[model samples]
Target: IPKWRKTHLTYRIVNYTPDLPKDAVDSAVEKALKVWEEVTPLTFSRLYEGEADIMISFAVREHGDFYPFDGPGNVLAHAYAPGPGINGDAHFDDDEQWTKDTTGTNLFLVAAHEIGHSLGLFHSANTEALMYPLYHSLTDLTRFRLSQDDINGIQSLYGPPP
Candidate 1:
């Protein structure tokens, strides 16, 4: 039993490589992936050494895509809902200082949030939810995990995996 699209939605990191060191992307991607795993029965398989379901790509300047990132601030990144094309794809703006901690918006935090959208989640009215429209660099221990509303939303779609 999978999640979206009747199968475990795949993802891959693309384009926007981090300005930081090599493992930086891997670390952030791993942290982001864990966010979903902890909240759902869904499992993810890392395809090709580069073949990833949620390809964590990077980009700078005005790359393609309907959603043009609003420069350094505003929207740090965006993703597509699960489906074909760039679905489940996560993009990080290399232009930003995607830190691993609070000094700047953590890539892990943003990726986790965007993944929620990829999983079909809308911005939660509850600012505490990870899907909140606003961004936070660090996990708000008080409100980072899946809230009741979140669980219900996903379950409503898949009816609790087999």
Candidate 2:
């Protein structure tokens, strides 16, 4: 897989989810982006208007895309690797109960995983890593440590600070 050609990138929240507070969604997205930023030299800026490198949104059931989401219990969100058009877009299934914690489908974990896909990293084989196939685990978030499997891969792609 190819990494992004640039380090300084931009992302925009194309739509907000009503499942959680607006501020909660904003903060959740912010931290998710930082999850990768904290690892590599890459920077993600919130572009208020215009098409950014990454366009994040929330929609439900065949929202004009091939990946039409089902009701719930599965497919909370999905993202595309870097490219054109919808390639770098991240979409969440509004049907799911999004939340800031484990009470529901945690937005932070899903967002981070989707954001990772948007930036170029793929599923980590290490089950303990944030980039693991599972959106995330409470213990992983509580411990707040980046698995070497994740860090090494991200660093290989985005590289360390200059």
Candidate 3:
């Protein structure tokens, strides 16, 4: 399968509901952003109260989108690839507590993993990979960075930096 190229594409958080208190959401998002920032050449901006190029929206239950999130356990979250409509949208199943500390699935960790998917990465066979299909709240620092295969995969689509 073909991979998505890193076009140095910009992104922004258009609008977010006040879920789990304003600061909590902000903290989770910030952590999620840092995860991607450390690996790729992508950069994102914080747009005001409007729909930016890439909107980071969150919801729970059957929130009207085609992909309705299941309650707490099963599927934690999901993200879309860059394109029209749902492109670059990351959704966290709000029914889940989404803890920052090491309980349940860490909102930051899962979101970062899902965001990688939104950025066009597929599940890696390596269990240590952040892009692994399964949900892992706890991971060693060594697996925190993007795997060599991941870098090569994304670079292949986007090509090396100019």
Candidate 4:
């Protein structure tokens, strides 16, 4: 799998999904990154200007890339493997109602999964893993923990946090 060459990767949120508040979106992104941070040596930082290794955004239909998102409810989000330019960027389908909780599609959960790709992880065969492509409703965010498969996958890529 293609992975980021550097441990300290930068990211930028180019735009926001109107379904949630700006700060909520920001917090969700940070928390999503934190999910991976807790297990890996990799560190993430945000940028307000200039290029970032991982760029995040929410768009409806065709935004700028060839992968035009469908209306809603099919694909929640996607990200590219590590590389230059558009690679490693994560895009969310703005057509779906993104939420901070169980009310709608959980932004943190989806973004965490997307970030896994950005950090060079592929979907897991273990259904309980965060890297699993299929989504499930995990209501208690406070109790959420990465499955052993997820930890193994990320640690295999970047090793355990030092």
**Steric overlap count per candidate:** 22, 0, 0, 0
CA lDDT scores, all candidates in order: 0.68, 0.83, 0.67, 0.88
- For candidate 2, write residues 1-162 as lDDT tens digits: 576787888889998988888899999999888877887888878898999988899998989988889987778889988887888899999998888776678888888778878888877778888788855458445656678887888888878766
Q: How well does each candidate superpose onto the true structure, as a TM-score? A: 0.81, 0.93, 0.80, 0.96
- Which parts of model 2 are misplaced by more than 4 Å? 139-142
Candidate 4 has what TM-score? 0.96
Candidate 2: lDDT over CA atoms? 0.83
User: Model 4, range 55-127, lDDT digits (tens) per residue?
Assistant: 8988889888989999979988889989999999999998898888777899898888898888888878887
Instruction: List where candidate 3 sits over 4 angstroms from the true fold.
Output: 1-10, 14-21, 139-143, 159-162
Off by over 4 Å in 1: 1-3, 49-53, 139-144
Greater-lDDT candidate between 2 and 4? 4
Better of 1 and 3 by TM-score: 1
lDDT of 1 by residue, 85-132 (tens): 677677777778877666777777787787787777777798667677
lDDT of 3 by residue, 44-82 (tens): 666656565556766788876888888868987788877
Better of 2 and 3 by lDDT: 2
| Candidate 3: 10-residue stretch with minimal lDDT | 1-10
Error of 1 at 23 (Å): 1.8
- At residue 54, what lDDT does model 4 achieve? 89
**By TM-score, is 1 or 2 better?**
2
Candidates sorted by TM-score, best first = 4, 2, 1, 3
